[PDB]
Design an enzyme around this catalytic site. Sequence first.
Site, PDB file in Angstrom:
ATOM      1  CE1 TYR A  95      -5.237   4.160   8.677  1.00 38.17           C
ATOM      2  CE2 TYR A  95      -5.000   2.677  10.593  1.00 38.17           C
ATOM      3  CZ  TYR A  95      -4.437   3.348   9.515  1.00 38.17           C
ATOM      4  OH  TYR A  95      -3.099   3.228   9.262  1.00 38.17           O
ATOM      5  CD  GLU A 137      -0.563   4.675   8.133  1.00 36.31           C
ATOM      6  OE1 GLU A 137      -1.740   5.001   7.935  1.00 36.31           O
ATOM      7  OE2 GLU A 137      -0.269   3.593   8.684  1.00 36.31           O
TER       8      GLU A 137
HETATM    9  C1  HEM Z   1      -4.983   0.215  13.896  1.00 35.56           C
HETATM   10  C2  HEM Z   1      -5.204  -0.394  12.721  1.00 35.56           C
HETATM   11  C3  HEM Z   1      -4.128  -1.208  11.979  1.00 35.56           C
HETATM   12  C4  HEM Z   1      -3.109  -1.969  12.431  1.00 35.56           C
HETATM   13  C5  HEM Z   1      -2.576  -2.289  13.853  1.00 35.56           C
HETATM   14  C6  HEM Z   1      -2.425  -2.524  11.261  1.00 35.56           C
HETATM   15  C7  HEM Z   1      -1.327  -3.359  11.264  1.00 35.56           C
HETATM   16  C8  HEM Z   1      -0.672  -3.922  10.195  1.00 35.56           C
HETATM   17  C9  HEM Z   1       0.447  -4.817  10.348  1.00 35.56           C
HETATM   18  C10 HEM Z   1       1.024  -5.352  11.697  1.00 35.56           C
HETATM   19  C11 HEM Z   1       0.873  -5.116   9.125  1.00 35.56           C
HETATM   20  C12 HEM Z   1       2.050  -6.068   8.737  1.00 35.56           C
HETATM   21  C13 HEM Z   1       3.173  -5.052   8.506  1.00 35.56           C
HETATM   22  C14 HEM Z   1       4.279  -5.417   7.522  1.00 35.56           C
HETATM   23  O1  HEM Z   1       4.008  -5.732   6.322  1.00 35.56           O
HETATM   24  O2  HEM Z   1       5.465  -5.333   7.923  1.00 35.56           O
HETATM   25  C15 HEM Z   1       0.026  -4.401   8.176  1.00 35.56           C
HETATM   26  C16 HEM Z   1       0.115  -4.524   6.806  1.00 35.56           C
HETATM   27  C17 HEM Z   1      -0.853  -4.202   5.902  1.00 35.56           C
HETATM   28  N1  HEM Z   1      -1.914  -3.388   6.159  1.00 35.56           N
HETATM   29 FE1  HEM Z   1      -2.456  -2.716   8.135  1.00 35.56          FE
HETATM   30  N2  HEM Z   1      -3.040  -2.088  10.155  1.00 35.56           N
HETATM   31  C18 HEM Z   1      -4.087  -1.310  10.513  1.00 35.56           C
HETATM   32  C19 HEM Z   1      -4.896  -0.748   9.572  1.00 35.56           C
HETATM   33  C20 HEM Z   1      -4.814  -0.939   8.188  1.00 35.56           C
HETATM   34  C21 HEM Z   1      -5.675  -0.234   7.252  1.00 35.56           C
HETATM   35  C22 HEM Z   1      -6.724   0.861   7.594  1.00 35.56           C
HETATM   36  C23 HEM Z   1      -5.397  -0.655   6.036  1.00 35.56           C
HETATM   37  C24 HEM Z   1      -6.080  -0.098   4.749  1.00 35.56           C
HETATM   38  C25 HEM Z   1      -6.600  -0.970   3.871  1.00 35.56           C
HETATM   39  C26 HEM Z   1      -4.345  -1.650   6.130  1.00 35.56           C
HETATM   40  C27 HEM Z   1      -3.814  -2.337   5.054  1.00 35.56           C
HETATM   41  C28 HEM Z   1      -2.683  -3.142   5.060  1.00 35.56           C
HETATM   42  C29 HEM Z   1      -2.105  -3.869   3.916  1.00 35.56           C
HETATM   43  C30 HEM Z   1      -2.653  -3.857   2.484  1.00 35.56           C
HETATM   44  C31 HEM Z   1      -0.860  -4.526   4.479  1.00 35.56           C
HETATM   45  C32 HEM Z   1       0.157  -5.428   3.807  1.00 35.56           C
HETATM   46  C33 HEM Z   1      -0.414  -6.843   4.107  1.00 35.56           C
HETATM   47  C34 HEM Z   1      -0.624  -7.491   2.778  1.00 35.56           C
HETATM   48  O3  HEM Z   1       0.451  -7.651   2.116  1.00 35.56           O
HETATM   49  O4  HEM Z   1      -1.790  -7.842   2.386  1.00 35.56           O
HETATM   50  N3  HEM Z   1      -4.034  -1.852   7.464  1.00 35.56           N
HETATM   51  N4  HEM Z   1      -0.898  -3.646   8.863  1.00 35.56           N
END
Ligand code: HEM
Lengths: 403, 403
Positions: A95, A137
């Site tokens: 994060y 998580e």
């Molecule tokens: C407060 C911080 C964060 C927020 C609000 C956030 C939000 C999101 C959202 C809105 C999605 C799209 C959800 C979906 O697939 O239905 C997502 C997907 C994703 N997130 Fe996060 N996230 C955060 C932190 C992180 C962190 C720390 C990681 C670690 C690497 C991460 C890695 C990913 C990945 C790999 C995906 C799938 C997108 C893709 O296919 O490349 N996110 N996250």
Amino acid sequence: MLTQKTKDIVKATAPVLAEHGYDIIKCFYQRMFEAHPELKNVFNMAHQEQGQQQQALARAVYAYAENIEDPNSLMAVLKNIANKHASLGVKPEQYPIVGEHLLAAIKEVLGNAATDDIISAWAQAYGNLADVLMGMESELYERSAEQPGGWKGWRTFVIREKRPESDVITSFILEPADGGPVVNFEPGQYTSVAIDVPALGLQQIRQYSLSDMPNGRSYRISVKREGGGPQPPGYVSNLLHDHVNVGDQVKLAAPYGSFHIDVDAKTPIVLISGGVGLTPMVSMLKVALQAPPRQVVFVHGARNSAVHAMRDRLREAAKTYENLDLFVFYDQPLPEDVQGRDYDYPGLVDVKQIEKSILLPDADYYICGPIPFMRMQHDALKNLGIHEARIHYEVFGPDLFAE
Amino acid sequence: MLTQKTKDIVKATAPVLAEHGYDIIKCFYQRMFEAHPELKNVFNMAHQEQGQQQQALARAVYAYAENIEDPNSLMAVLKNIANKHASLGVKPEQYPIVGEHLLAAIKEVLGNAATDDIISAWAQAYGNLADVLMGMESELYERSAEQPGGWKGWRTFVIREKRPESDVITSFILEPADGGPVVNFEPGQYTSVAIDVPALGLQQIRQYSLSDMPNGRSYRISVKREGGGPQPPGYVSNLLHDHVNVGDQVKLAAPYGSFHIDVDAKTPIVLISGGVGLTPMVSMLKVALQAPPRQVVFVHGARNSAVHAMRDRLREAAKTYENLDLFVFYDQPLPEDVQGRDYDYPGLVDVKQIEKSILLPDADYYICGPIPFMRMQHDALKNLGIHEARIHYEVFGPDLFAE
Ligand code: HEM
Ligand SMILES: Cc1cc2nc3c(=O)[nH]c(=O)nc-3n(C[C@H](O)[C@H](O)[C@H](O)COP(=O)(O)OP(=O)(O)OC[C@H]3O[C@@H](n4cnc5c(N)ncnc54)[C@H](O)[C@@H]3O)c2cc1C
Ligand SMILES: Cc1cc2nc3c(=O)[nH]c(=O)nc-3n(C[C@H](O)[C@H](O)[C@H](O)COP(=O)(O)OP(=O)(O)OC[C@H]3O[C@@H](n4cnc5c(N)ncnc54)[C@H](O)[C@@H]3O)c2cc1C
Ligand code: HEM
Ligand SMILES: CC(=O)N1CCN(c2ccc(OC[C@@H]3CO[C@@](Cn4ccnc4)(c4ccc(Cl)cc4Cl)O3)cc2)CC1
Ligand SMILES: CC(=O)N1CCN(c2ccc(OC[C@@H]3CO[C@@](Cn4ccnc4)(c4ccc(Cl)cc4Cl)O3)cc2)CC1
């Protein structure tokens, strides 16, 4: 925790982030990957080119903003995200990484207009959301680890069977290399496959609906081979189709997902699927047909008989069970497909053509397919007078695209 | 938010962090300053060779771990930290920076022992704390900004007067360069001076108790010249004594601190100070002597007359006010200091020697001085039967050293 003024700056500047979403995303990934190249093994490198994550960003910020005063609405969408993050194996220690580069990107893109008040507001929003998500998580990881056959991280599976369902969809039946039990799941949930992509020199990870009922021993996924058409073929689906064979190994995540039937419910279920979107529906179908009746209307749209997955098993089920109604729509029927014989209606799924059959009192409706198909089905159900609380959906891309 | 299992890993591994605190602190600052050298303008660069920070880290992780089940105890110490961070100008966007480098350092120092479970638990702890702190700090910034004469960040002040109080303590009376009002404060609160140190080629920041009563126009600080003895001289205190003169400018923070009298209280106050620790006591004395009586016993320990600050003003006050009792202890009286004439008792402040005079019903006790002095006074007050709820203290280093 955010003060009123901070929420207000977020509300006011959400459109500013949204309309610069393209550059912020590009800058974010460039910064983040320069500092942590290993994270390319977790993010999708295909989406890294295309529109389009910019659409999702805009939708996230706008949905965050309009809901920042309503913690209940906020908690629900956060659950979808936590499930997806857990499937990918997102770690608390990541994060701060994501937060720094996201803020550095907003700063760079906004230039002179990246005032202290704005950067500070979003930095606080980020830390508030991060805390909520890490704990969701963590709970998800622990619940999985503690259940019979459950685990954290990747578990090696071996392909036991690989059965073509149509010219484009193939089913993989998967047992764990260690021969032990596999955790239960709710029908509608998914796993993630993490596999090395030699064309990329990186791991990639993709979600796949668990397309069979839970059995303690094995999982089944049904993978549509992607692309060619006018656009690039997909990395993982072609790789699974052509290079992952019986006896090979893949890494799987424990099941996650907030799109699923309530297995303990008496009430009817209507299952509306386009193409490969039928995969969670089949799991739901097979569990629901465990009487407790419950009453299932399986509504499926496919192009024709050559692409229709599990054609024979579905019609055989409809002959055998009283509580199942099957409706198949062919959009472009083949010369050898005949209406009233091999399928029920021509064209796209149309709910008005089966209105009495689907308007079951107390019914829950489930929808999975391409986004245009989903919005079409969503709108149609609303027009009949069905409450939004009774309509559920799972996206085969980003869950925020038709919200 | 932390699951039971996460708090349990924190409780079980605190000792491991504490034991490796030295290396983690060294690695944390190395990583952090390599990536963000500009932060050296916010941290104290006399950690040159200091274990003071390892001591504080070890105490923090142990106190955190032992209290993790008691959010109320946790909130109270987090308030002391929020006030100090707000005085320093700590920004929300800096939380992901510190978090990443701290976690990277924990990971590098622990090496093989930095298991996923441990890194994940402390990463969540870090984010949980960050969220609470950012929200507290934001509330503190907003309250200051909104009050008459208040502000956020640095406000430029000019030294109007510079008055020696002893051989080692000099007062600076400060008015804003802009000529506007200054915000009120609770007596016992501090400001932070931020000033360029040319020997370091850096800005440095130090807290100084506001040594006078609030008046809407000016602030006063009283600065003891540090060091020489056997150890290096202090940067900022020597700089202020020797190069900051009437007419010069320094930057100040709005007042912060959770150590202060309740100005609205009728009840008695006993003010126990060692050396420069008198500075918040004087503010508190001058406000309380606004009848509303209230009843003040000013107990002060200093080495001798040459080093006793504000000697003449304090005795003159004790001649003029009925509700003030003054007790001065000289630890190393000079040949020309006579007991019963220029001071009341030889040696260190000893509360048994003034027990009837200090055991006022309903009394609050305030203590400020070096840490050994503070523990001594603390213990002594407990031995009389005073409840811990009635004993207050402010540290001239780290507020967690005698908790
Ligand atoms: C407060 C911080 C964060 C927020 C609000 C956030 C939000 C999101 C959202 C809105 C999605 C799209 C959800 C979906 O697939 O239905 C997502 C997907 C994703 N997130 Fe996060 N996230 C955060 C932190 C992180 C962190 C720390 C990681 C670690 C690497 C991460 C890695 C990913 C990945 C790999 C995906 C799938 C997108 C893709 O296919 O490349 N996110 N996250
Ligand atoms: C919850 C969930 C459940 C899912 N369940 C299933 C399931 O049961 N069965 C199933 O088959 N899939 C499912 N999916 C979709 C699946 O996860 C993968 O998205 C799919 O297999 C494509 O992966 P890929 O690596 O083959 O394609 P990628 O290489 O990741 O490409 C993605 C898509 O973009 C196109 N593309 C790539 N590059 C470009 C470009 N530069 N410009 C324009 N277009 C481009 C490709 O043609 C492809 O269609 C699910 C997705 C989710 C989120
Ligand atoms: C809440 C609060 C209120 C305070 N109020 C006052 C006040 O009212 N009046 C007041 O005078 N002070 C007050 N202080 C202390 C003040 O903030 C400064 O710490 C003090 O002036 C020393 O700063 P410096 O720059 O001179 O010393 P620094 O340069 O920061 O050095 C710190 C100390 O360590 C010693 N040191 C430096 N290098 C080494 C070395 N390598 N090895 C061993 N020792 C070394 C120095 O001699 C010095 O005493 C307060 C502190 C706090 C937290
Ligand atoms: C969860 C995150 C944090 C925690 C738990 C934390 C905790 C603490 C504690 C316990 C202290 C000792 C207070 C004292 O001086 O008595 C402190 C001081 C300090 N913190 Fe933090 N802090 C955090 C984040 C940050 C951030 C993001 C910054 C930005 C630079 C920062 C900068 C400082 C500074 C400059 C000090 C004073 C120490 C010094 O004089 O060098 N801290 N913090
Ligand atoms: C229909 C279709 O074929 N579709 C397939 C999926 N395709 C897609 C893939 C990933 C994706 O991701 C969501 C968004 C995009 O950018 C981030 C990335 N991110 C950050 C933390 N976790 C994820 C992000 C999130 C929050 C914040 Cl405040 C800032 C950022 Cl930059 O989320 C969005 C879309 C788009 C095309
Ligand atoms: C007189 C003198 O010469 N001395 C006076 C005291 N002065 C001092 C400086 C720092 C200090 O530190 C407290 C703790 C210990 O170390 C950190 C550093 N830190 C981090 C965030 N804010 C500060 C810390 C905090 C929380 C976390 Cl989770 C992780 C870390 Cl490593 O602070 C304690 C004291 C140092 C100089």
